[model samples]
Target chain A: NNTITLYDLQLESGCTISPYVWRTKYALKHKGFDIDIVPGGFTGILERTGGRSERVPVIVDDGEWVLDSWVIAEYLDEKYPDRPMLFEGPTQKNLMKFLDNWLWSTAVGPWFRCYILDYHDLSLPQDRDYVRWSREQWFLGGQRLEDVQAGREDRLPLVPPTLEPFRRILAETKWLGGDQPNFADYSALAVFLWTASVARTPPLTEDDPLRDWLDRGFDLFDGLGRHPGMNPLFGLKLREGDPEPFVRQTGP
Target chain B: RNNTITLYDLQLESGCTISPYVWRTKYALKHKGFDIDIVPGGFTGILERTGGRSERVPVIVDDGEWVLDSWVIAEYLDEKYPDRPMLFEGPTQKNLMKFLDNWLWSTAVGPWFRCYILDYHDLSLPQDRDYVRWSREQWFLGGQRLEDVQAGREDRLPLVPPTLEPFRRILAETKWLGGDQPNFADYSALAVFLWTASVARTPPLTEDDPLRDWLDRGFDLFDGLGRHPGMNPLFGLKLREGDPEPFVRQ
Candidate 1:
């Protein structure tokens, strides 16, 4: 086992941590890496590591620092080379890269905007506040609901098509990462989770595979939301049994 | 034009069809005899000049001249390699080809940005977390925070609204888009065709098997044609290069 340590943020309840971090955490668990998962002071983690320019999922392995979830995931795969997180083929590799590019850039961003930032229908206060807070964090430096939501009206057209391709894919296979789930599968799922749990706006129908995938995906983590060895980031609660009424009623 | 060719190439890497510059280059290369030898040039810094042109990968050398702007490179390739070409061999085909190419250039890539969101901002690095967080927040979250940008095509062929209708139209009359045997013309449209389906949250196939079958055929072909082993001898053959970049680069 390699000397692996994951520095996580401390948060709970209404706390929405980066869905990306959860992606790496799940990979580690799936690979069974004997990692020392540690939670760091949000302030201390960034300052002490000089990862602010790069940020998050700073992997400390044998005293070497690696930044970026995608890069880190790759590093681990190289280090272990056991149950590879990636498929072993050129097209598949490119497809995986394409998936990474497509999901994060297009789908998740809009989901964040439409649901969290509120570019579409704007009657609810919670939606408005969420947008403001998100925008504040994006531009001014951290969650300020009112400020982020200011010019949202002109942004609707920008976010509508982000998930269209993935929606098409879900219609075909069980997972975005192909027949057997891999990093691509989880990456796409993270976007879906954000849309379903956080954005909670579009409300995918029965025909939407993204919705279906998100439902079962949480089951993997035992409905414990995101366990980065820190408090809950997504605020998802996964009990051992019984389906919630709302979860069952939802289509797709 | 008897026979001509142009390829969007980086001195150190293979051409990127996903990139407009590379797409145009591939179209030109295939337009002729598929006989061009792609070169591998050194990486060009974003702000630096490549071959006296301001650009990144995909600076194409056409008939010995440097051309930038991926779209323009495609047009140039089409103009020279007139026979067995990439243009749609149909009426209003140019318009359709343009629309297809435009989408690939415009909205084809919406996923790469997701990595940045998870890494630069939301990640849990203690030391620089705030800086990256602040950067992400400022760039992505702040009221002035920028949202990810996706391409839009105003004049997209008003595809049949029926979910799989657009795909059916593309698959119906041709084995490969520029008709009969596939041409460089079909590559962009075909790749994006795969991407559009792949990104669907719940694909229509899970609901309708036939559509799924159609996608399977095309996706499988795409997978085969662009396999890492077939193209990148350096990376795929020996495993000397662990990273994915060496494969695409010359």
Candidate 2:
């Protein structure tokens, strides 16, 4: 089989919303390949992987299944040596590795607390029960999903500081991975894309510098992430037909 | 046409190199094939050595020009010797490393201060310890002595590895942070760890933490350049009081 296929996360709203999966999608596109995404886990990730993993972002290249977002990226690079390099050799790759860790610690760990309920509420009916229970029991230390995300707006002020490094680097270079877009850029952007996919209270403001970069990222590859009906990750006001987006309280 | 540079680095009474910043500059020097002379600079001596230009160790005196800051010196070496193996790929990696430096300092380097602050004062030269107490303990720690800040550290030993988690994750895939070869990313990371490596009687990482192999490899690089006496046990074993310490006062 010469075809390369990716299993991605798709929500009930027809949004391909997994940040980890988004990372692979970007990696595949960055390597100059037409994406062949199949939502393998919508039915049963367990059944799909034969009890191996219950997660999406798994890839099949020439009938070889590679799981995990990073492992998939590494496999693609090693297999296709002549493609547009996903990581520009070791220094950038190593930095991206560290950057991924920093993001997990700084962004995902904190940001997950803020919008996890929104994710659960937005999950497909088949997945909702498991999502809520798993997140509450395992991820939230048994805290009620409602209570954990209740005062999330109070936590919004912490977002900008963690993002300052990404902002500063973007100001100097076109991309975090440097001049041309690379995996570091793709990896970092896909994270906010996750937020953009599901966050009810958009984390960034309309005037935030990251908006420009996020818009540019969404604009890439025939409007890959900016598909209509998706939530706005920045600024207040959802589309007219939907529920009003949450407006963060300004200073007194 | 100078063949050598003089690094004004810090030392304890036993004269082992300690400053992670200086260690980074030393690695940068070695990376560029320059002979270096280590001139031990105490806290007071730095003021006079740089003609009041700055107040810091890791100052590089090359061709009679006194440079400041490890980051600045990294840039200087690359600019001076462009033909040598460059520390950065371009402006992008340089900016990324700058971000990494700040992130690492806050995440690992600065947080490690309280962990090693007491041992650092105890192991410093008798002349410099006084300044450390006054400057770091009184000014920074609000008059709380270093020992008080460092008390009960063993009970909280589990809290240290999260700061080093990113490094541990990177080392699992690549032999060095710069991939196959050692780059400034590897150097600066090793530099940050060397702070705990140089001090911290308590073990930060657990035994068989996988990072032990990386540390040994780092120490053996550049003709065993980092294999100095008295590196604190970051992993494998906890250090008891008076475990035959090196680079401490007589």
Candidate 3:
């Protein structure tokens, strides 16, 4: 009976397909929590646990039943006041919040890589399977780039302009926090991980600061198995036990 | 301000989870270490009112006053419970607040799209699924695939790399978002994030995981606070005694 129980999904590859899970795992370790994880859940897990509204990543710490990564992080912070998750002072603390929220919103999408670009390159025969599988999955069919751009034409317009500031920040700042990486670092990575792994379309460039940052960031964990060249992402991920194998994505 | 709060929950049950909004309420309360009564709310409950907010949950009822949006709720709570402070001790609160709000809503496009556009279509309701499918194109990508958005296989999308870059650097710096002390910023922001991971079906961090040593130490930090009778169930957070049971038994 460990102090905390973590609900994890057991994948043969050991790498998590979902970046959201990666973010939680990353944060939990970052904060120094003691946790035991079980395999992740399925639809039935959701139904049985009264999670019809949501699925797994549900946590039961001691007698407390907590769901949601954000809640879990906060709860853990509250209970474990030793090494705080945010900055010690007001100004830096708020900055951390801003960064966490910022990354979640700006970084966590697939329009550029996993979704949009992948679908367009469907001419390759291997891509044909990806197209068929994802189309059946409905994620591809629903969020078609044409439909998104045309509808938001009056508002967000194109993806390029919207992503500029974030790119510049990566290019300029050593880190969002200048010298230190905190909640913002993990939160930002959470979204990017998804974009790189699942997005059929992505706006990132390998030569950019962000890609380099990810290389250094995930390289430590070896979390991003898809990108083996990312020297930084070599062995940091906790899911892959010692000598985490470098796996690549087989999807479009 | 009247303490009566109305929470927009689909249903009040132990197993079922709430939207990120619900997670905020739990977060603010725990961060402040205070307990408040929560009234359940239904889906799209707040859209009926709240000054034209997108349909969302965890809408607060403060003495008959309805506050829509989690960010708004956080501000309201900060205002209400000034003494039981959620913010930290410094001059950088505004920037952090802005970052928190922006990341939750703006940068979280991937998860939101996946949840609404992709996962929603996987629902049991044909009409709901169809509406979700049609709406995905309208509100998001409009039937265009990723290739159309990024010319190359790994194009950097808007607001991602920059926003995420800071965090990577943070890992090189501190244990928590706030230097070393866990504060309202982490709690509030992290609480809001809980639902996204749940909905997205992500995994939790554990001590045994190698790459998660920082996270492992973090849980130890969390337990130190929780083990305290005054803190264990901060904000009425109930802990399961005895041996750890399966969150969902097969």
Q: Across residues B154-202, which tens digit of lDDT does each residue of candidate 3 receive?
A: 1222223234333434444556565566555555545433443333221
| CAPRI quality band, candidate 1 | incorrect
- Model 1 TM-score is 0.41
Would you list the C-alpha lDDT of every candidate in the order shown? Answer: 0.44, 0.74, 0.46
Q: What is the DockQ of each candidate?
A: 0.02, 0.40, 0.13
The ten-residue window of minimal lDDT in model 3 chain B covers: B228-237
Report the poorest 10 consecutive residues by lDDT, candidate 1 chain A: A229-238
The sequence of per-residue lDDT tens digits that candidate 1 reaches over residues A93-195 is 3334445555666666444544443322222333344435445666443644444444443443344334555555455566544455566666555555444
Model 2: which docking level applies? acceptable
Candidate 3 docking classification: incorrect
Candidate 3 lDDT over A1-252, as tens digits, reads: 434666653232233434556556666666665657655422244554455235456667776777776666666667766754633353464365445544544443324322443333322343344445465446444654445434322232233344444554555455554455544566567666644543332344333445666755565344433442111212212222222122222334
Candidate whose DockQ is highest: 2
Error of 3 at B10 (Å): 52
